[PDB]
Design a protein around this nucleic acid. Structure first.
Ligand SMILES: [Mg+2]
Ligand SMILES: [Mg+2]
Ligand SMILES: [Mg+2]
Ligand SMILES: [Mg+2]
Ligand SMILES: [Mg+2]
Ligand SMILES: [Mg+2]
Ligand SMILES: [Mg+2]
Ligand SMILES: [Mg+2]
Ligand SMILES: [Mg+2]
Ligand SMILES: [Mg+2]
Ligand SMILES: [Mg+2]
Ligand SMILES: [Mg+2]
Ligand SMILES: [Mg+2]
Ligand SMILES: [Mg+2]
Ligand SMILES: [Mg+2]
Ligand SMILES: [Mg+2]
Ligand SMILES: [Mg+2]
Ligand SMILES: [Mg+2]
Ligand SMILES: [Mg+2]
Ligand SMILES: [Mg+2]
Ligand SMILES: [Mg+2]
Ligand SMILES: [Mg+2]
Ligand SMILES: [Mg+2]
Ligand SMILES: [Mg+2]
Ligand SMILES: [Mg+2]
Ligand SMILES: [Mg+2]
Ligand SMILES: [Mg+2]
Ligand SMILES: [Mg+2]
Ligand SMILES: [Mg+2]
Ligand SMILES: [Mg+2]
Ligand SMILES: [Mg+2]
Ligand SMILES: [Mg+2]
Ligand SMILES: [Mg+2]
Ligand SMILES: [Mg+2]
Ligand SMILES: [Mg+2]
Ligand SMILES: [Mg+2]
Ligand SMILES: [Mg+2]
Ligand SMILES: [Mg+2]
Ligand SMILES: [Mg+2]
Ligand SMILES: [Mg+2]
Ligand SMILES: [Mg+2]
Ligand SMILES: [Mg+2]
Ligand SMILES: [Mg+2]
Ligand SMILES: [Mg+2]
Ligand SMILES: [Mg+2]
Ligand SMILES: [Mg+2]
Ligand SMILES: [Mg+2]
Ligand SMILES: [Mg+2]
Ligand SMILES: [Mg+2]
Ligand SMILES: [Mg+2]
Ligand SMILES: [Mg+2]
Ligand SMILES: [Mg+2]
Ligand SMILES: [Mg+2]
Ligand SMILES: [Zn+2]
Lengths: 206, 18, 60, 23, 83
RNA sequence: UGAAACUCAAAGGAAUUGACGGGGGCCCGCACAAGCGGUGGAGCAUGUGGUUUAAUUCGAAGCAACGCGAAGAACCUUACCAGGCCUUGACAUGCUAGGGAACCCGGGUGAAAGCCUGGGGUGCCCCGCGAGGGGAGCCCUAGCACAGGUGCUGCAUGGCCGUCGUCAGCUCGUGCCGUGAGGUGUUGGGUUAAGUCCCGCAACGAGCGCAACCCCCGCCGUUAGUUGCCAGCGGUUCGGCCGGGCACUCUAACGGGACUGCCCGCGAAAGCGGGAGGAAGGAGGGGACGACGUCUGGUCAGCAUGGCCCUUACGGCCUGGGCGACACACGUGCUACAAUGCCCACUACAAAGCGAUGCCACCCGGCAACGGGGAGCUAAUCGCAAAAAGGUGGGCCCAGUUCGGAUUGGGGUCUGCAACCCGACCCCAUGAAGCCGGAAUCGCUAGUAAUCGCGGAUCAGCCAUGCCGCGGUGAAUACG
């Protein structure tokens, strides 16, 4: 086991944090807890919408959560009435005025977190794990991506002897910092144990 | 015949009690 | 001995000296950083996601 | 030597002060 | 050792058990878990059953064992050698 | 000449990819050599084996386990042991029933936990000049669904990490070769730190790697000028202190600068030797970055997670004990054995960090650890702070010593509910082994090794001599 997380490797160069705020030594952590707590709520509730990235912005006693969901209609609800039921339920733990934006997804087949979640879904749904890899990587490249790689690990097909299966198209320069590589992870639960789904999309260099 | 290692002679179980 | 010790560290104790940190993410008793309220592992996990304001893999 | 608490040397080592190394 | 600016330590619940006994014409056999308690001159001539983690070791108390904690007289490791 | 009983599920031929060779060739790495300091002996610190124990919780196992998980075990931690206790439970949601509570002050007992307990007084929308009965944050007694499990399987798993190895390699698409595995390309000449690049070629391209983009350090510019700086004039209790000023130093963002660009020489080319300008030259020093894979490598005890298992107990609370045991054995370290040294006084020069139940100036008490007072600092301002080796001066005179500071007696300080097991520190006294370490054995190629001190994470305190950093001083040697 060797390889560095490609997003933590690009923080400051190609990648921005999921939380933007200064806070001092005396209350940084307490903001971090809410931050982690917030995302829990929304990954727990807005998973069905195709959640991709929870950006959390803070100025002072007013917090600015920003969801990046594939189908935002599943978030807003009856014309702002689902968004409301959580724009409120957020303040129920927030304590601050929890201003909640929903942002469109440019192309879901270009959001590594989603590709993962969808392959993870398919293998949770008893499809051929080898097929799903070669299919996801196909869909990504059709979408103009300059390279894409998917990786499955665990008891594929419930085979006792765990295994690792992957497939890759285009190019994925992991050692390059100027390469924009969306990386997401999904976790696939089954009756026989757990499998890990890793998705790498080369979006292009800068 | 209880929790962890060493074993108490029953399969799987050890000597430590709660 | 996990969950009942997650709770117990929260409880305010019979004595000041019995206070101790735990990771608020995973429950770890050891290697808990005060600044984050996090063990050294969860620290490295949340960091690499960029879910930690301003934190960046140092180098020099 | 550094193991000698009773010298200016041993207090520099154990990072303490006293008669044998005041401040 | 304990800062003499502060007290001389006895859990206050073992001391009470003694003074009472002193009053009514002692001695009952005193059992307690306060190994950290000091041997105090009021105790001399009682016998305090001290806990060694497993048993209450019975300890007679004489004028010359007064500066000490009671735990000093009920050891906790049973060793008896190698061989 | 030439059988059989009996017995096996193979015995074989060629060729393929590997791996291996006390086969070959060509390369390389503190691999050896050349050197410099150490380990192996001593005493002690810590980890481990073994043993012991009521328990000495559990894991890591050659390199790559052994100051490793442990970036802080007196209680807590704690997963172990003894004993005293709880049973929808310390925690989650949800269904009832009876109180109808919410929450803050008590008390009897007991080591505490617990068991028994005693006070006051709740809105919510209501029919209210009413008796007041509902309903409802959320509490409680019983009853359920369920919680709980650091119990097992790392040989069912995800994730993360170790490692070979920053080694130069691993492949693919189409074409070609072969019945086929497979081959070619990736081999060959030259080159490079490099499957780096050149030339050659039944191959032509392409991907993962190498390099590059990122960070620190080295020179210069711009932009800034307080809390930082003081070149030159004005004051000055002589402190950049005040006037002023941002030149410089610095601080922290944005740039420039090195590319074999130029000259000579070799060469088919790539490059290679040397030269000049230049702060810096052949990748300028250092870091971050770790290929396809390997090892049924490590982790079910961080977490996640399938299956197995426990249910007044393999769960949970408590007090005490243990994790600190000691005929022994190993590992990683600290301090030394002394004069290129030790000691006292005096006096210089860092860098990086930390600091509002914190850092503590300074002042008095105390031989001191400390205590009491007590300014400033939300900190380029105030503090931790003194750096230490160094330099000056004095003392020791080759001695188990003015070397060494282990062990033990006594007397204190502080943190802490509490230092018996089992804390650190201070002062008096004590003053062990050790005279440079058997067989054997480790690290380092330059601001390196060696030597000197400083800081931080954890943290009440601390068993840190550990770890991660920081600058001071600054070598030896590499033929091959
Ligand atoms: Mg089943
Ligand atoms: Mg054992
Ligand atoms: Mg047995
Ligand atoms: Mg238990
Ligand atoms: Mg503690
Ligand atoms: Mg902690
Ligand atoms: Mg053959
Ligand atoms: Mg050598
Ligand atoms: Mg030695
Ligand atoms: Mg030794
Ligand atoms: Mg053992
Ligand atoms: Mg062990
Ligand atoms: Mg285990
Ligand atoms: Mg420690
Ligand atoms: Mg306990
Ligand atoms: Mg304990
Ligand atoms: Mg394994
Ligand atoms: Mg694994
Ligand atoms: Mg194992
Ligand atoms: Mg190879
Ligand atoms: Mg082909
Ligand atoms: Mg053919
Ligand atoms: Mg082929
Ligand atoms: Mg090859
Ligand atoms: Mg090859
Ligand atoms: Mg080949
Ligand atoms: Mg060949
Ligand atoms: Mg290389
Ligand atoms: Mg070729
Ligand atoms: Mg600098
Ligand atoms: Mg200027
Ligand atoms: Mg690289
Ligand atoms: Mg194994
Ligand atoms: Mg687990
Ligand atoms: Mg499991
Ligand atoms: Mg230990
Ligand atoms: Mg030895
Ligand atoms: Mg050590
Ligand atoms: Mg040693
Ligand atoms: Mg300090
Ligand atoms: Mg002597
Ligand atoms: Mg001798
Ligand atoms: Mg002497
Ligand atoms: Mg001396
Ligand atoms: Mg003493
Ligand atoms: Mg102690
Ligand atoms: Mg001598
Ligand atoms: Mg030597
Ligand atoms: Mg080298
Ligand atoms: Mg020295
Ligand atoms: Mg230190
Ligand atoms: Mg500390
Ligand atoms: Mg000790
Ligand atoms: Zn954690």
């Amino acid at each position: 086991g060797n390889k560095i997380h490609p997003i933590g490797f690009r923080l400051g160069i190609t990648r921005d944090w999921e939380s933007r705020w200064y806070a001092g030594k005396k209350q940084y952590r307490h903001l971090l807890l809410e931050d982690q707590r917030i995302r829990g709520l929304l990954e727990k509730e807005l998973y069905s919408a195709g959640l991709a990235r929870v950006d959390i912005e803070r100025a002072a006693d007013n917090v600015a959560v920003t969801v990046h969901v594939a189908k935002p209609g599943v978030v807003i609800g009856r014309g702002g009435e689902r968004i409301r039921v959580l724009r409120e339920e957020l303040a129920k733990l927030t304590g601050k005025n929890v201003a909640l934006n929903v942002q469109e997804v440019q192309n879901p087949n270009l959001s590594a977190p989603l590709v993962a979640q969808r392959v993870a879904e398919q293998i949770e749904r008893r499809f051929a794990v080898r097929r799903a890899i070669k299919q996801a990587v196909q869909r990504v490249m059709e979408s103009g991506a300059k390279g894409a790689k998917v990786i499955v690990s665990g008891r594929i097909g419930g085979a006792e002897q765990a295994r690792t299966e992957w497939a890759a198209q285009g190019r994925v320069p992991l050692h390059t910092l100027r390469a924009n590589i969306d990386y997401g992870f999904a976790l696939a639960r089954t009756t026989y144990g757990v499998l890990g789904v890793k998705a790498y999309i080369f979006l292009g260099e800068v | 015949s209880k929790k962890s290692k060493p074993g108490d002679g029953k399969f799987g179980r050890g000597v430590k009690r709660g | 001995a996990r969950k009942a010790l997650i709770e117990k560290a929260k409880r305010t104790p019979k004595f000041k000296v019995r206070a101790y940190t735990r990771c608020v993410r995973c429950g770890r008793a050891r290697s808990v950083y005060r600044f984050f309220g996090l063990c050294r592992i969860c620290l490295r996990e949340l960091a690499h996601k960029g879910q930690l304001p301003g934190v960046r893999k140092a180098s020099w | 030597g550094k193991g000698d608490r009773r010298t200016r040397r041993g207090k520099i080592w154990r990072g303490t002060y006293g008669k044998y190394r005041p401040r | 050792p304990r800062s003499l600016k502060k007290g001389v330590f006895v859990d206050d619940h073992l001391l009470e058990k003694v003074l009472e006994l002193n009053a009514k014409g002692e001695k009952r056999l005193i059992k307690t878990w306060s190994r950290r308690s000091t041997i105090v001159p009021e105790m001399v001539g009682h016998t305090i059953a001290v806990y060694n983690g497993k048993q209450h070791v019975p300890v007679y108390i004489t004028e010359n064992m007064v500066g000490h904690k009671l735990g000093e007289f009920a050891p906790t490791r049973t060793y008896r050698g190698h061989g």
